[model samples]
Target chain A: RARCYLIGETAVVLELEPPVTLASQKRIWRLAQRLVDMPNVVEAIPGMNNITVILRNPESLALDAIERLQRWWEESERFIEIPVVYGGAGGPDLAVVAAHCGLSEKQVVELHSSVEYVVWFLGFQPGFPYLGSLPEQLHTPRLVPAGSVGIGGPQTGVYPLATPGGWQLIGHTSLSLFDPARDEPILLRPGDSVRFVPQK
Target chain B: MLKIIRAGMYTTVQDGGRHGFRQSGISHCGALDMPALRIANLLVGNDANAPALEITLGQLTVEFETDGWFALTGAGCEARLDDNAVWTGWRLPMKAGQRLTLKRPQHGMRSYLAVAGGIDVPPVMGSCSTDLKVGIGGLEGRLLKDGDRLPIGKSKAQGVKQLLWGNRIRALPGPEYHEFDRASQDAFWRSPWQLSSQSNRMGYRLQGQILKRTTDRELLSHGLLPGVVQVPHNGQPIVLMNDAQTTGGYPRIACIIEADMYHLAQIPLGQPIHFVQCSLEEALKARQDQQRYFEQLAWR
Candidate 1:
């Protein structure tokens, strides 16, 4: 469920993404529009992973939109599940990463596929998202460039900083993680959950 | 009027810049080194913020139309009037029909030339300073070019005193100075940085030792004052000179104190710069002392 929160005149501490579904993605686009169309909203920059809603409007006007979106997030129960394409060599660091948690790659993949990950904060660059929580076995450091697909401590995210990064790579997501030009722009938001499935 | 026989890289007319318009994204486009420009003006007896001719890594030759006062300050360059040697850090006078030519600076990067009554150019957005990004200010919102005859105000009469030169002046060292890490801070003061082709009035993109961030916390964009030397994620520090943007998100490494910026303006590209830390008290004292000296001169 989306919890309303505020950060620097923008929202995202409040409503989050619903499910990882095409339908929910459509909803994400509408919600983004509602905020952007709100009077006093300066501009809304839609990035691949997130939308930055610039608000020049008074706080009193913004509060109404924030409240409405917050309720929507709390009531949504839709979820999205994507495949965990690879593990071990295919995933790289799967063995060492699993061993760090006293589990094997197979067990790591099983645990990872079973639970869902939530979207948290987004920052460092336009459109990058900070996802919350990862399966214990998937935890690793940021990879140098090429983006870190693995879990880093409590956050598993797409290394969207574009600059130099070092997050460990566990598996890759092929759903165009984020594309600014897409109608929906960001595919995930807070309150959203995603489960990984084994590919082939 | 001056002729851009060799417009080095980018030369333009500048003054104190436009202010009170931040939400519109207009930056203050004054001289990167303000004091240097002011010194040039003082020698010519013009208002401190009067517009002056700013020459980048290039040469300038001007043919005086009539007898008038003129002075060159900022970067130290080899200048001569009708084959007579000219020295920086002092104001000199020129006579009618005399040709003043500036040679490629042996040391500094940018040099400023101020004439009596200042360079007369139309002001944009309440400033004569040039903002290249918005393409509005200076002459046609761009650098000065050949055949650009800047109109000088009516001439003035002076006393029997032949002429006088400027006294040696120094500037404040740095704005954050000690906060930098040993390697980064040491390199800043020790190593001379090369000005890249990317450098401009907006800022100088220095090619030097990259500084790593000790704290990788993401910072929100904040209002940026001119002369803010910020280090972005690239680690390469960029000095925001005149015409710098209104806000930035990078971590500021230092600010060239007001005094030194003018001195810096005189230096041309490819010249290395160093910094010395100063106490706020010292800066205040220096300004007050200079003020008193000027005050006495006014009385005289």
Candidate 2:
């Protein structure tokens, strides 16, 4: 299996492009399996934007793999689109988000409906991704909830683990984002990018 | 046989500890200072893990019903037989109605009063340890008190005069000692640290140098062993005891070596102590030597 190669003890972080497709997720998973023999892969946790591999042995990550990892990320996507989603009655803070971003409710909905997002890493819980690069007009400060389903300045993220977090809630996904029984317990890893689409 | 006359403060029976329940969140609750307990048991010709009386601050007063061998270990407390002061190391043979009263400790916290043939409390979970968290082991699953009748096991039938004198018991080093900085290392060896008030059989909250972490990352919780010196978010270090939780996320600064764990057991809440470090191999050798020494005495 083809996977990302790392050199030394550095924690390799990857950023993905918009619309974290199934094909891309497959590629990321295969890369991780291939690099299992690497000495530095002490911990590998998947997230929305990308996968994070903590290399334990500094001397083990061959310099060659580090360059290849960077190249793979760049060739994958030069730019990603981070979408803005507004909150309504079910969304909770549609008015608050619009007023804070200095945009009307209609503009908030329009801007949010227009952009794309990339899933970063999944943490705190299963399938909860840390998304990035939200629209400037719709970006708002995050609130306090470790595994909150909320949006922060130009970025949307889900808490994979229980902790404290802050993000503006546009809506909540009812899906049990994580299922341990499934083949892959994590929905996303550190290196896979994600893109969110606004509802009609 | 010793009969409980006045069990003051909190006292109970103990042995090595209850183990193999970490996954179920149960701790290995045993003697706070295992070395002292071993010594006390050895002097009386009992097994190393034989159930013995662990007294805190020496409030317990016991009387021997007849003449037999007994020894008091841990806390370095002074013991008097029939109102006559007897030394700590060697065992003493008492006659009927001979009273043994323990005064406050001189160097440690809890002392182990071991008798010949061990204290015959029904073993719980394969050990005689008193697990207060679950309240399963020990006598009546609680501390011993006045009017408590203790059953004496088969004694070694050997007299106290046969044992050797001047046996050396030393300290051991923990797994995470390297995590401490150089300054901390120097301070640990030179300065005496006090055991805090908020401490118990599970852990010892120490008041001394604050161990700092280089990184603020959230560490994943994993299995924890006894004697682990955990430096939590508060910066203060807590030395894990017998009843400590199975796993934790706090960065550990160091662990108390196995042999010296008894040294800490003898210390009182406010007593000062300095822990010296030793190699893992050296620590194991110490135990092996001690075990051999005790076995020789038992056979004789």
Candidate 3:
């Protein structure tokens, strides 16, 4: 079900077999929650279906750290909606995506928003989430400038910080994805299910 | 108080590091040369984690607005306090209105400047360090610019041997060492890598032997850290640094020991650097030995 390995002296990561889905990520979240509270653990980060645990002083502990994390993962098991506005400057490539997917602009909106997407992991930037899956027919191009939600091949998500394109532009949101001013900086976390309500 | 008359190439405020938020997608944005930063802070009566100016390749000029003490470390830049020469690895009293100027460092890549009471900047997400990638923390979350004035924090030294700068770094192989080709593994050890021009605070792209992998299986994203030597598809190894992303997909071949990572900060571009393979026990002993000097100075 899972494999565990050491990254360096201070960290050990527990990763699950492929077919990354909501089921596996949820379990990772649960496992990470427990690992973060364990002794000597400094930061236990949960990714799509993997968790990396950093230790404080892991010299002697380093020897069995991989096995220890594996044992913990073997024993363990584990919401947010994003508001988006479809098609305009923020969603510049909407026409392009619609043409490529052989759907009307309206149909693209309905189909893209048809299902609920879960946060697989945060990458590229803080608070930026990699949503679990996009519809089979809707996958198309890439490009952006945070809050710009778009789909790239099979990947669909919102950018938290302002960076350049790799995702096809579809929509944008006004809400802040992250604020370092807050005691808790990030707005999303791994395993939290999200929805995209197409705003007018 | 301090006034930045001329902001060097890439100067930013830095402390020890930002911790406890790595899992939140935050990076450990801090001083690349840890020992230098700590020693500089100590010279001015500040704790090791106090905020200091991290100047890349020197050439910084500042005017003191408050009478206090200051210290310099890391890159051995030719420096002057008005007409008086300022030596690296030592502290000196400062008078209001005195101008401190630093030329490009002759050897190392980064320089550190620590003032009494530290630099006054609001901590973003519990750190005074700058994370330029996401544009958060430090002064407006970016590198210093000329004419910017920094407020001095209120709080809290002498000549010591200039810290030894070296090219030898030690590391331990792998989260995926066995996955690499046998010749590639041999090349990684036998070859002397040079820091590519693409090297930065995020990752040091080493330009030497192309160490190829033996597998075609792609891996899912996993947590990454400073010192993790990741080899991408191009075969060039990238040693992640303070500003490294929390997660990466590249295969890791080795991890530079924490004790020897500071050497990377001092190494100039194009210098030949060697990675000595070390055991877990040796790595721990090295860190403890490095920690001893800092501990003795802090408590004793």
Best by DockQ: 3
Question: Which is the leading candidate under TM-score?
Answer: 3
DockQ of each: 0.03, 0.03, 0.69
Scored by CA lDDT, what does every candidate get?
0.57, 0.60, 0.84
Ranking by lDDT: 3, 2, 1
Show what share of the native A-B interface contacts model 3 retains: 0.64
- Residue runs of model 2 more than 4 Å from their true location after superposition: A1-200, B156-192, B275-278
Instruction: Give the winner by lDDT: 2 or 3.
Output: 3
Q: What 10-residue stretch in candidate 2 chain B is worst by lDDT?
A: B161-170
Candidate 2 has a TM-score of 0.55
Q: Which portions of model 3 miss their true places by more than 4 Å?
A: A141-143
**Candidate that would win on lDDT:** 3
lDDT of 2 at B94: 60
TM-score of the A chain in model 2: 0.54
Clash totals for all candidate models:
31, 60, 6
State the lDDT of candidate 1 residue by residue for B197-261, as single tens digits: 68766677878887765676554334444455787778787877656655455767765544445
DockQ of 3: 0.69
The list of candidate 1 runs beyond 4 A from truth reads: A1-200, B1-8, B83-96, B155-197, B287-300
iRMSD computed for candidate 2: 12.8
